[PDB]
Amino acid sequence: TAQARDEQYRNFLRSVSLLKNLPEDKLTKIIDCLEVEYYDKGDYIIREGEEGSTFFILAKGKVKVTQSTEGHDQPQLIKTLQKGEYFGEKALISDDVRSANIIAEENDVACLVIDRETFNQTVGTFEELQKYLEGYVANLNRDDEKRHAK
Numbered sequence: 001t002a003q004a005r006d007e008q009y010r011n012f013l014r015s016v017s018l019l020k021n022l023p024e025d026k027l028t029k030i031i032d033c034l035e036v037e038y039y040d041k042g043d044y045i046i047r048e049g050e051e052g053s054t055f056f057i058l059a060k061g062k063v064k065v066t067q068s069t070e071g072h073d074q075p076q077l078i079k080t081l082q083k084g085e086y087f088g089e090k091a092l093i094s095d096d097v098r099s100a101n102i103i104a105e106e107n108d109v110a111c112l113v114i115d116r117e118t119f120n121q122t123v124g125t126f127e128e129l130q131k132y133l134e135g136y137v138a139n140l141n142r143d144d145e146k147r148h149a150k
């Protein structure tokens, strides 16, 4: 049933520390509106420099983050992310183009995709969550500065 499917997504999303304290009604909005995208080894989920207005939660598999830096022809490997982590918030919070590539590291990667309106009405409205992601993005900014991102 729909209710059971919803309960399953609820359990997973509550396991994502970012969403652990979100009010039930906002979590429900995410559950109703999320979409799921699958990727295989090497597929670019996000490309650096592109417009983007969606937020991703990694529901299965691993992805790597690459980014163009000074003195390097090719994007450099910054980190990998795994199930339970997230990405894509920076373009929304900063009102910017995508600031790094996100690349599937293995087959059958699955991301929960949340569009801009849902993000703003859920994650952008719960003050505690917005303030947190802002600290997160500011930290990303400092990291970019350190490695001299192009």
Ligand SMILES: Nc1nc2c(ncn2[C@@H]2O[C@@H]3COP(=O)(O)O[C@H]3[C@H]2O)c(=O)[nH]1
Binding pocket: 046, 052, 065, 078, 079, 086, 087, 088, 089, 090, 091, 092, 097, 098, 099, 100, 101, 102, 140, 141, 143, 144
């Ligand atoms: N700028 C930046 N983005 C990062 C870093 N590590 C992970 N990311 C993620 O990569 C994403 C690329 O798209 P975004 O919308 O710019 O949001 C970014 C972050 O979620 C980092 O060190 N710097």
Ligand SMILES: [Ca+2]
Binding pocket: 008, 009, 012, 059
């Ligand atoms: Ca699931």
Ligand SMILES: [Ca+2]
Binding pocket: 096, 099
């Ligand atoms: Ca920028």
Ligand code: NA
Binding pocket: 085, 086, 087
């Ligand atoms: Na994360």
